[PDB]
Design a protein around this ligand. Structure first.
Ligand SMILES: *[C@H](O)[C@H](C[C@@H]1CCNC1=O)NC(=O)[C@H](CC(C)C)NC(=O)OCc1ccccc1
Ligand SMILES: *[C@H](O)[C@H](C[C@@H]1CCNC1=O)NC(=O)[C@H](CC(C)C)NC(=O)OCc1ccccc1
Lengths: 305, 305
C-alpha cells in the first residue's frame, strides 16, 4: 500500500486562479462566479505595510485601479468591498470553470491542500495541517499571497485558507475565505508571535495505525494505560490532551486493526519516554502529526474524487 | 520561504485519465490524442497473473473486449497493439483535452509527480523519485495500475512512468510510456528482488543547500575534503559516489550560498560519521534524498507553470 503525504487533485482550483494588480503590488486571486477574492494588502505600498489604515487606503481606490487578468484576458471590475481582511472585486463575467464550492473554517489538526501560485499561475501543490497555534508550515515566497487551501469531497471544493504573511519563525498565517484570520494575527509588518504549538495527539495516533496497516509494528508494546495517566505524560511532552471524542474518531481504526485505543496510547507513551533509538516508523525518525484519521482511511482504502 | 515536498499541478493530467475494462480486470488508462495507453496485464485473470503468455492471451481478444470509459462516455475501440508491456488501444475520438505532451525515460535520482487513480478518477498527487535500483516508494492500492508519473515544463507534460506492480518489500515498479520496465522487473506475480538501493548523494547535497537558504546551518562544519576521500567514506555508508558532473550541477547552488562544493561534502561526511544527535534539518531527523538540484531552485525561486 505505502503511505505518502498526499494532496487532492488541483484540477478544479487551477481554473479559479487569476492575477490581481493594484498599483505596484501584484498577488493571486480566487475567481468564483462573478466575484474575485484576494488579500486586502494589495492596495498597499512598501511603506504602507509598516502600519496601514486599510479604510483610508481603500477610499483612494476606484474600480479601474484594480487590474484583474485571467490568463491573457482582462476582467472588468464593476465593484469592490472590504470584508475583514479580503477584497471582493465584482467582475462583469462569471467564471465558466466554477465548480461546486463552499467556504469553510477548519479547526486545528485538520489537513488541506495548498496550491501555491505566482502571478495567477499554479506552481505546485502540497499537503498542510492547521497547527495548534493556528499556523502552518507552508512553502511561500514573495507574491504567493492569494494562494488558497482547500479540500475536495468528490466534486465539491471546500475552500478553507488564503495565504497572507510569514512570521519571524518562518511559519505562515492566513485567513479563511471570509477574511477572518486563523489565530491572533493581523495583516501588518509587525513582529508578531504565534503561541506554544502543541502536537496534535490524535493525528500521531492515527498515523501509528497507518504504520500497523503497512507493516511497521516494532512499537506495539503489550502495555495499557488510562486517559488521565496518558494525558499527564502528554502534558510534559507538549502534546494535546485526549478526549472521548478523539477516541470515538479512532474507533474504525481501532476495530480494523484489533488494537485497542488505550493500548495504542501506551505505545505512544513509550515512544515519548524512550525516544526512537535510531529506528523509523513509515520511513520517518519523528512522530508525524500531519495526518488526520480521515487522511489515513482515505489512503488505506483508496477513495476517488 | 519554507521547504515542502511539492508536486506539479495535476490539472492537465486529470483530463487524460480513463477507465479501461477487459473481462474481470479494470485499471486506469492514459488517453492522449486517439490512443489509449494502459498496462497489458488488464487482459489477465487472477490465475493468468501467476505465469502469463501475453501473446497467447492477446490472440483471444478483439476490439470489443475492451471497455474504455471517459467519465460517463464510452470510447469505441477500433484497434489494439502490444508495445512491450503496455497496450495501445486505438479509439475513434481524439481527446479534446490533450496537452503538449512527450514521452521521456528518466534516470535514477530524478523526481516526478504521480497522480494516483482508481476507476479512471484522480484520488491524489504526490512527489516521487526514481531510486538507485529503479524502484519508487509510492502509495498504490489495488486498481491503481495505469496511474502515471509526469513532470511539467510550463505547458508541456513530460510523461515518464506508469504503475504496474508492488514488490515483496513494499516498494513499487513500473515502465515508461513505451512499455519498457525501469529495472530488471517483469509483469508476473513472481517473487522478484530489487537490488541494493544506494542513496542519491547529489540529491542530499542539494537538500542541504536548501537548508542553508532557509536558515538551518548547525551542520556547516569548517572542514574540507577531496572527492576521492569523500567517496571512500560514502562507499561505506551505501551512498552514490560523486563525479565532476554532480559538482557542476551543484554549481549555481554553490555560488548562490558562497559554500564550496567540496566544503559541503565535508559537512556530509561528518553527518554520516557522527549521526544527527537528535537534531533536525528542515524538520527531518534523516538525510532526505527525494530532491534534485532543480527541485531546490524551483522552490527557492518560485517557477510558475
Ligand atoms: C504576500 O505575498 C506575502 C507572503 C510572504 C512573503 C514571504 N513569505 C510569505 O509568506 N506576505 C507579506 O509580504 C506580508 C504583508 C503584510 C501586510 C501582511 N508580510 C510578511 O509576511 O512579511 C514577513 C514579516 C512580517 C512581519 C514580521 C516579520 C516578518
Ligand atoms: C495493478 O493494479 C497492481 C498494483 C499493485 C496492487 C497492490 N499494490 C500495487 O502496486 N499490480 C498488480 O497487481 C501486479 C500484477 C502483475 C501481473 C504485474 N502484481 C502485484 O503487484 O502483486 C504484488 C506481488 C507480486 C509478486 C510478488 C510479490 C508481490
Amino acid at each position: 500500500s505505502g503511505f505518502r503525504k498526499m494532496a487532492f487533485p488541483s484540477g478544479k482550483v487551477e481554473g479559479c486562479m487569476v492575477q490581481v494588480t493594484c498599483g505596484t503590488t501584484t498577488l493571486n486571486g480566487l475567481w468564483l462566479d462573478d466575484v474575485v477574492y484576494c488579500p486586502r494588502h494589495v492596495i498597499c505600498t512598501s511603506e504602507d505595510m509598516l502600519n496601514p489604515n486599510y479604510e483610508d487606503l481603500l477610499i483612494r481606490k476606484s474600480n479601474h485601479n484594480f487590474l484583474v487578468q485571467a490568463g491573457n484576458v482582462q476582467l472588468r471590475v464593476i465593484g469592490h468591498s472590504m470584508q475583514n481582511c479580503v477584497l471582493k472585486l465584482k467582475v462583469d463575467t462569471a467564471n465558466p470553470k466554477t465548480p461546486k464550492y463552499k467556504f469553510v473554517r477548519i479547526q486545528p489538526g485538520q489537513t488541506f491542500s495548498v496550491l501555491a501560485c505566482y502571478n495567477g499561475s499554479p506552481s505546485g501543490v502540497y499537503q498542510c495541517a492547521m497547527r495548534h497555534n493556528f499556523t502552518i508550515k507552508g512553502s511561500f515566497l514573495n507574491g504567493s499571497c492569494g494562494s488558497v487551501g482547500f479540500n475536495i469531497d468528490y466534486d465539491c471544493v471546500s475552500f478553507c485558507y488564503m495565504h497572507h504573511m510569514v512570521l519571524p519563525t518562518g511559519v505562515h498565517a492566513g485567513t479563511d475565505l471570509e477574511g477572518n484570520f486563523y489565530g491572533p494575527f493581523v495583516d501588518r509588518q509587525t513582529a508578531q508571535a504565534a503561541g506554544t504549538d502543541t502536537t496534535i495527539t490524535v493525528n500521531v495516533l492515527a498515523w501509528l495505525y497507518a504504520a500497523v496497516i503497512n507493516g511497521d509494528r516494532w512499537f506495539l508494546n503489550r502495555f495499557t494505560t488510562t486517559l488521565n495517566d496518558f494525558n499527564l505524560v502528554a502534558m510534559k511532552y507538549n502534546y494535546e490532551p485526549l478526549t472521548q471524542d478523539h477516541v470515538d474518531i479512532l474507533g474504525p481504526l481501532s476495530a480494523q486493526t484489533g488494537i485497542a485505543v488505550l493500548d495504542m496510547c501506551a505505545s505512544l507513551k513509550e515512544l515519548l519516554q524512550n525516544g526512537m533509538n535510531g529506528r523509523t516508523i513509515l520511513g520517518s525518525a519523528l512522530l508525524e502529526d500531519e495526518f488526520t484519521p480521515f487522511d489515513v482511511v482515505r489512503q488505506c482504502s483508496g477513495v476517488t474524487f
